Design an enzyme around this catalytic site. Structure first.
Site, short mmCIF file in Angstrom:
data_model
loop_
_atom_site.label_atom_id
_atom_site.label_comp_id
_atom_site.label_asym_id
_atom_site.label_seq_id
_atom_site.Cartn_x
_atom_site.Cartn_y
_atom_site.Cartn_z
CG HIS A 61 -2.13 -1.06 1.34
ND1 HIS A 61 -2.86 -1.34 0.27
CD2 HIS A 61 -2.26 -1.90 2.09
CE1 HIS A 61 -3.75 -2.18 0.26
NE2 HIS A 61 -3.33 -2.73 1.76
CG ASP A 65 -2.69 -8.62 0.99
OD1 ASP A 65 -3.81 -7.74 1.10
OD2 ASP A 65 -1.88 -8.55 2.07
CG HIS A 119 -6.52 -5.66 1.68
ND1 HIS A 119 -5.88 -6.33 2.87
CD2 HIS A 119 -7.70 -5.13 2.35
CE1 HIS A 119 -6.98 -6.42 3.83
NE2 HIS A 119 -8.02 -5.65 3.52
CG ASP A 179 -4.70 -9.82 4.01
OD1 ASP A 179 -4.52 -10.39 2.56
OD2 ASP A 179 -4.31 -8.93 4.29
CE1 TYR A 194 -2.65 -7.56 9.38
CE2 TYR A 194 -4.27 -7.96 7.50
CZ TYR A 194 -3.15 -7.26 7.92
OH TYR A 194 -2.47 -6.43 7.17
O1 LIG Z 1 -3.87 -6.21 5.08
C1 LIG Z 1 -3.75 -5.06 4.66
C2 LIG Z 1 -4.33 -3.83 5.07
C3 LIG Z 1 -5.38 -3.89 5.95
C4 LIG Z 1 -6.36 -2.73 6.28
C5 LIG Z 1 -6.02 -1.40 6.35
C6 LIG Z 1 -6.91 -0.18 6.68
C7 LIG Z 1 -8.01 -0.67 7.04
C8 LIG Z 1 -8.63 -1.92 7.12
S1 LIG Z 1 -10.18 -2.42 7.87
O2 LIG Z 1 -11.23 -1.88 6.84
O3 LIG Z 1 -10.40 -3.74 7.90
N1 LIG Z 1 -10.20 -1.76 9.42
C9 LIG Z 1 -9.41 -2.00 10.41
C10 LIG Z 1 -9.18 -3.22 11.12
C11 LIG Z 1 -8.00 -3.17 12.11
C12 LIG Z 1 -7.24 -2.04 12.39
C13 LIG Z 1 -7.51 -0.96 11.69
C14 LIG Z 1 -8.46 -0.95 10.59
C15 LIG Z 1 -7.59 -3.04 6.92
N2 LIG Z 1 -2.86 -4.80 3.40
O4 LIG Z 1 -2.31 -5.67 2.94
K LIG Z 2 -3.90 -8.40 -3.80
ZN LIG Z 3 -4.06 -7.31 2.97
#
Ligand SMILES: O=C(/C=C/c1cccc(S(=O)(=O)Nc2ccccc2)c1)NO
Ligand SMILES: [K+]
Ligand SMILES: [Zn+2]
Ligand SMILES: [K+]
Length: 353
Positions: free
Chosen positions: A133, A171, A173, A264, A304
């Protein structure tokens, strides 16, 4: 045929001092490493040393401004750290964050170098914080510097500028940072599979949609495979690899494969909501091994559920070490996604026509 492995407990020092239960935990990497010991995989690998990335190496993908700001976090008081982290989308910072991010990058550089010089055939990098990211000029989504992107540029810097690198991002995301960094580039093919939900899933941008295919000479060298309305698992990822990822990858003919290997999308993940099995990840790993003469580097991103990621990544390592793949209907929503991508990239890849 040797498999490299890099892990350094120093990368555990990066922590969230306001929410100690934030899911991007220090024990993510120590748990994966421990499972490698338990399964007696660790002794089967060549231990590749971790190192700090240099600021010069960071500049391969990032601005001097961004590097300086994160670098200065090392000496900040809690007030400064809190406020700074808050300037970003979903970032926490401690006094150890900069150093850990540097270790994650340098670890992957050493691994890439070991693969490219032939010391090892393939490798796994158990590192944190994640990277995909991270943008040229900003931190985002638990990521500070883009480890996978920097590793691709590092690979090019020790071979030739036009070294064809494939990055497969499984991943759950979208790797927004990696897409943007290579968006106008045809030397680095970026392929991401991700939960999209019409843009409602983090990182919440339509940049992640299938119609974003690259820019300029990089047209065709960005492949987004977005999932909508469905709990995707092994059948969906296998179908995407069969119809999309492997055909495109074989035509591209990479000389090095990097996996932005977040886990994840795994069954049991508290954030992903998907159900890819450890055997699933094993089969994905095994297919990628047929590329680039087996030159594959697996890089930890997200993931996670501590038990899930330990089992999933260990399984990948088992595949890299040469163990035989374990044994495994398609959701129609996934078929729609795959067809949207095939339609978007048929103009660029003959293997899809
Ligand atoms: O795994 C990730 C990042 C995950 C991510 C980043 C920002 C927000 C979220 S969320 O919508 O699932 N909410 C959340 C959960 C725990 C801590 C902070 C935000 C998840 N990138 O590869
Ligand atoms: K991906
Ligand atoms: Zn992710
Ligand atoms: K690209």
């Amino acid at each position: 045929p040797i498999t490299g492995l890099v892990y350094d407990q120093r990368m555990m020092l990066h922590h969230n001092m306001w929410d100690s239960h934030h899911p991007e935990l220090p024990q993510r990497i120590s748990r994966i490493f421990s499972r490698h010991e338990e399964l007696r995989l660790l002794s089967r690998c060549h231990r590749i040393p971790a190192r700090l990335a240099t600021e010069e190496e960071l500049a391969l993908c990032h601005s001097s401004k961004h590097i300086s700001i994160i670098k200065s976090s090392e000496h900040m008081k809690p007030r400064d750290l809190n406020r700074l982290g808050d300037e970003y989308n979903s970032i926490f910072i401690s006094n150890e964050s900069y150093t850990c991010a540097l270790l994650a990058a340098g670890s992957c550089f050493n691994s890439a170098q070991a693969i490219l010089t032939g010391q090892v055939r393939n490798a796994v990098a158990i590192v944190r914080p994640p990277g995909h990211h991270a943008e040229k000029d900003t931190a985002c989504g638990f990521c500070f510097f883009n480890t996978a992107a920097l590793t691709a540029r590092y690979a090019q810097s020790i071979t030739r500028e036009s070294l064809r690198v494939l990055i497969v991002d499984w991943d759950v995301h979208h790797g927004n940072g990696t897409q943007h960094i290579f968006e106008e580039d045809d030397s680095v093919l970026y392929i991401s599979l991700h939960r999209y939900e019409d843009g409602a899933f983090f990182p919440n941008s339509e940049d992640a949609n299938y119609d974003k295919v690259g820019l300029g000479k990089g047209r065709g060298y960005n492949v987004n495979i977005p999932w909508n309305g469905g709990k995707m698992g092994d059948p969906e990822y296998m179908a995407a690899f069969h119809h999309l990822v492997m055909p495109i990858a074989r035509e591209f003919a990479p000389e090095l494969v990097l996996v932005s290997a977040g886990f994840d999308a795994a069954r049991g993940d508290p954030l992903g909501g998907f159900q890819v099995t450890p055997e699933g990840y094993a089969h994905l790993t095994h297919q990628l091994m047929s590329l680039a003469a087996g030159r594959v580097l697996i890089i930890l991103e997200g993931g996670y559920n501590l038990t899930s990621i330990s089992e999933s990544m260990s399984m990948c390592t088992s595949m890299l070490l040469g163990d035989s793949p374990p044994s495994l209907p398609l959701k129609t929503s996934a078929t729609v996604s795959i067809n949207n991508v095939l339609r978007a990239h048929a103009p660029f890849w003959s293997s899809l026509r």
